[PDB]
Amino acid sequence: GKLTNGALEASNVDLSKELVNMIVAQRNYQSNAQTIKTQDQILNTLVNL
Amino acid sequence: YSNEQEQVLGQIVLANFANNEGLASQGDNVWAATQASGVALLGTAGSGNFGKLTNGALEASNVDLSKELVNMIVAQRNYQSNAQTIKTQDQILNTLVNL
Amino acid sequence: GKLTNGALEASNVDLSKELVNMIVAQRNYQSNAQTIKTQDQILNTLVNL
Amino acid sequence: YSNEQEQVLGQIVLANFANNEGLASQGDNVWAATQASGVALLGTAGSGNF
Amino acid sequence: GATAATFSLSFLNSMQQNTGANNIVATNQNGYKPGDLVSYQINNDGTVVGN
Amino acid sequence: SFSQAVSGLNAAATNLDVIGNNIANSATYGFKSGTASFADMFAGSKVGLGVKVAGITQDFTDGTTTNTGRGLDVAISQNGFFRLVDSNGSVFYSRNGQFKLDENRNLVNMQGMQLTGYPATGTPPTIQQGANPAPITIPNTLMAAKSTTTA
Amino acid sequence: SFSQAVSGLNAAATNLDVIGNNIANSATYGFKSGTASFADMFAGSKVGLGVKVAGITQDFTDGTTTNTGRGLDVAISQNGFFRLVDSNGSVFYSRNGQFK
Amino acid sequence: VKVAGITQDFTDGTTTNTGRGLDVAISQNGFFRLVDSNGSVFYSRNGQFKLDENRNLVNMQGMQLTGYPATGTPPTIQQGANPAPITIPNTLMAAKSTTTA
Amino acid sequence: VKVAGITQDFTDGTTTNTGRGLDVAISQNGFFRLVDSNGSVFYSRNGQFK
Amino acid sequence: VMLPDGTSAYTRDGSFQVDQNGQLVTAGGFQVQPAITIPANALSITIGRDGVVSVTQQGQAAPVQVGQLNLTTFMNDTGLESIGENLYIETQSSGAPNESTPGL
C-alpha cells in the first residue's frame, strides 16, 4: 500500500469491545474460582472423615 | 492477482460421521475418527447433509456457565452425601471391631 | 541483554498462581497428616492387643 | 546464533517398551529396563507409536 | 429416454360461480425427484421420521 | 458394602471433573460441552451393588457465530467437520476456524495441523472432486500469461 | 482434579491480562490488538484434563489515519512494514511512522 | 427377621430437557424394549439413545431399540408385525413416478 | 495372602504449563532416555532439564 | 491359562499383563489361553463384551483383531482344586471344562 504523508496510523483497539471482554473474562475467572472452591470443600470433607 | 483475474487454489472439504459422539477427543479442540464413530463421509459445504460455511466468523463454544454453576452445586451435594455414607460404614466397622 | 536507564526490573511473582499453589499444598499437607494419623492408629491397635 | 543462522545440535530420542509395567523403578523419578519390560524400542517423538 | 409418466389427473371439488376471476386454489401430486437423507427425528407419538 | 459408596463417590468426582472441564472451556472456539452418563451395577443380588460411569457424551449443538472480521475465520453452521492432517499423515477433525497462513503457504490451524481439501488441476484450474483431499496451499508463484484462443 | 480448574484460572488470567494490555495501548500509534487462543488438553481419558493457551494472535487491521501537520510522520496504508536497524545491525519491522 | 424382598419405587421422575433429537423420555407408564447382541430382550426407562456405526438406534450399553418396522411404498407402520431393531439408513431414496395428480 | 506384585498406572498425567524453555513434556507413550556417569541406561518421564 | 507343565489351569482374576514377547499373561506370569498376542506398536486395546480383543495401529484405518478371549465353565464349580496364585485346576468332581464364548 501507498504512504500517507503528514499523518500517523493510530492503534486498532476499540475501548468498548475491550471493556465488554474484560467483564466477560472477569466472570469466567470468578466461575473458575468457584470450581476451585468446590474442590477445596470436597477435599476438606474427605480429610475431616 | 494483479492482472484482474481470479484463480482457485482449493476447496475446503467437510466430513460428517454416522455417530458424532463416537469421536475420540485428542485435545487441541480436535477429534479423531474411531470405529464407533464410523467412517468419515466427505463432501462440500451446502450439499447433502453439510451446512454452509460462514466466512469471517468464528463458532464459539456451547458451554452455558449459568447451567454449569448450578450443576456443580448439585454434584457437590451428591459427593458429600456419598462421603456421609462412607463415614457411616466406617462407624459400622468400628462398632463391629470394638467387640 | 539491553540496559534500560531510569527503570527498575520488578519481581516476576504473580500472586494469583502462588495463592492457588498455597491452597493445593495445604490440601496435600492435610492428606499426608491424615496418613500419619492412620499409621498412629495401627501401631496403637497392635501395642494394645 | 547471531549470524541469523541456526544449527541443529541433536534430536531427543524416545523409548517405548513392549511391557511398560515390567519396568523396575530405581527412584529419582527414573526407571530401569528389565527382562520383564523387554528391550527398549528407540524412535523420534511424534512418529509411529511415539 | 426415460419412461413417460402416465397419471390420473382429477379436477374434483372444483366449482364455477361468480368469483373474482379464474384462479387455481390448489394442486397436488404424489411423485417426487430423488432425495438424500438430510435429517432424522423421533416424533411425539414415537414414530421415527427421516426428512 | 464399601464398594457401593466408593463407586458413588467416584461417579460424583467424575461428574464434578466434567463440570469443571466445561467451565474451564467457557471461551474456547469449537468446544462442545460434555456430560457424564451413569448406569446401575446390579450383580445377582437385588441390593444394587453400585454405579458406574458408562461414558462421556458430547453435546454437538451449534454455538454462537461471532464476527471477527478476519478472512481466515470460517465457522461451520449445522453439521460438518473440518478435516486436518498432521506431520504423520493422521487424519483429524475439528470445528475450529482459526486458520493461519504459515511460512510454507499452507492453511493450518493454531496448533499447526494442515487444512485439507479438494485441489485444483488443469488450465484453467477447476476443483476435481474425484481426487483424495490434499493440504491447501497458497503459493505466490506468479501467474503466467494465456495467449487468446477465443474472442 | 485441581489441574482443570487451575488451568482454567490461568487461561482466564492470561485473557484478562491481554485485554488490559490492549486497553493500556488504546492511544499508541502503530499498535495492533491481541487475542488469546485457547485449546483443550484431553489426554487419554474422557474427563477433559483442562485448557491451555495455544497462543496469542495479533489483529493486523489498519487503524484510523490521523493528520498531525508535521512532514516527518508517515502513515502506512494496506499491507507493508517499515524497516529499521539498531546499533548492532539487527533488522526490525514497525508500523509506527513517527520519525525524526 | 427375614428380608422379604426388595421393592422398586416405580414413580415418574423429573423430565429434564437436553436438546438432543435422539433423546426421549417416557411419561406415565411404559418401558422401552431393547434387544441384546445375543437376542435377549430387556426393558428400560432410560432414554439416552444414540446412533451406532451400523445405523441402528442403541443406548449407551449397545442394546438396540426395538419397534414396529415400516414396509411398502410409501412405508407404513406395520402394527401387526413383530418388533424389530430400529435402523436409520442413509441409503439414497429413489424417485417415484407420478401416479395421481 | 501373598503380594502378587506392585503394578504402576501408566496413564498420562496433566500437562501443566511452566514457561521454562528447557522443560519438555511427553504426550501419549514414550520415555526420556538418560545415562549417568557409569553409562547405565535409564528411562524417565520427568521433563525438567537443566 | 497354560501352566509351565503344559496343563491348563483356570483363573477368574482378570488383571492381565504383557510379557517381553508381546503375549497376554496373567499377573502371575502365566500365559492365558487362547494365545492372544499384542503387537509392539499398539495404541489402545479394546476387549469387547464377547471377549473379542482388538488393537488399533498408527496409520491403519481399521482396528485389528488379535484373538478371541473365551470363558470356561464347569458343571460343578466347587470341585475345582486351588493350586495358589488365584488358579483352579480340574478334578473328576468338577466335571469337564466347557469352552464357550462370553455371552453364549
**Rounded CA separation F133/F110 (Å):** 20
Nearest residue in chain I measured CA to CA from D26: I42
Residue G37 has a CB neighbour count (10 Å cut-off) of 20
User: Which of these, J19, J15, J5, lies nearest to J85 by C-alpha position?
Assistant: J15
CB G38 within 8 A of CB B22: no
β strands within F1-151, DSSP E: 34-40, 51-58, 65-67, 74-76, 82-85, 91-94, 99-101, 107-109, 114-121, 126-127, 134-135
CB B9 within 8 A of CB F138: yes
What are the chain H neighbours of F61 within 8 Å (beta carbons)?
19
Three cell numbers, residue E8: 390420473
**Rounded CA separation G63/G47 (Å):** 43
Given the C-alpha cell 489483529, which residue does it identify? G59
CB J13 within 8 A of CB J25: no
- Bridge-partner residues for J99, per DSSP? J72
Nearest residue in chain J measured CA to CA from H37: J103
What are the chain I neighbours of D50 within 8 Å (beta carbons)?
28-30
- Bridge-partner residues for H35, per DSSP? H41, H64
Interface test with H, best of E3, E9, E11, E32 (most H CBs within 10 A): E32
What are the chain F neighbours of A33 within 8 Å (beta carbons)?
none
**Rounded CA separation J29/D22 (Å):** 11
CB H31 within 8 A of CB H44: yes
* DSSP H or E segment with residue D43: strand D41-44
* DSSP H or E segment with residue J44: strand J44-47
**Rounded CA separation F69/H24 (Å):** 40
Which of F13, F19, F27 has its CB closest to that of A28? F27
β strands within B5-99, DSSP E: 10-12, 14-16, 24-25, 31-32, 41-43, 53-55, 57-59
Q: Do I4 and J28 touch (CB under 8 A)?
A: yes
User: Mapping DSSP to helix (H, G, I), strand (E, B) and coil, where does residue J36 land?
Assistant: coil
- Bridge-partner residues for I35, per DSSP? I41
Given the C-alpha cell 407408564, which residue does it identify? H29
Q: Do A31 and B79 touch (CB under 8 A)?
A: no
Interface test with B, best of F79, F138, F143, F146 (most B CBs within 10 A): F79
- A40 — alpha (psi -120 to 50), left (phi > 0) or beta? alpha
Three cell numbers, residue E47: 414414530
| Amino acid at the residue J64 | V
**Rounded CA separation I42/D13 (Å):** 13
Three cell numbers, residue A32: 473458575
β strands within chain I, DSSP E: 31-35, 41-44
Phi, psi (rounded to 5 degrees) for C48: -65, -50
Q: How far is G78 from chain F (nearest CA, A)?
A: 14
Residues 8-67 of H with CB under 8 A from J: 37-38, 62
What are the chain F neighbours of D46 within 8 Å (beta carbons)?
86-88
Three cell numbers, residue F37: 452418563
Radius of gyration of chain C (CA): 23
**Rounded CA separation E49/E35 (Å):** 15
Burial class, F136, CB count within 10 angstroms (exposed 0-12 / middle 13-18 / buried 19+): buried
Query: What does DSSP assign to residue I18?
Result: -
- Bridge-partner residues for I34, per DSSP? I42
Q: How far is G62 from chain C (nearest CA, A)?
A: 30
Q: Does D36 touch chain I (CB under 8 A)?
A: no
User: Mapping DSSP to helix (H, G, I), strand (E, B) and coil, where does residue I48 land?
Assistant: strand
Cβ-Cβ contacts under 8 Å between B and F: the total is: 228
CB F71 within 8 A of CB B55: yes
Distances from the Cα of F68 to the Cαs of C44, F74, G28, G96, J74, in angstroms?
A: 67, 10, 22, 24, 68
Q: How was this structure determined?
A: cryo-EM
What are the chain D neighbours of J58 within 8 Å (beta carbons)?
48-49
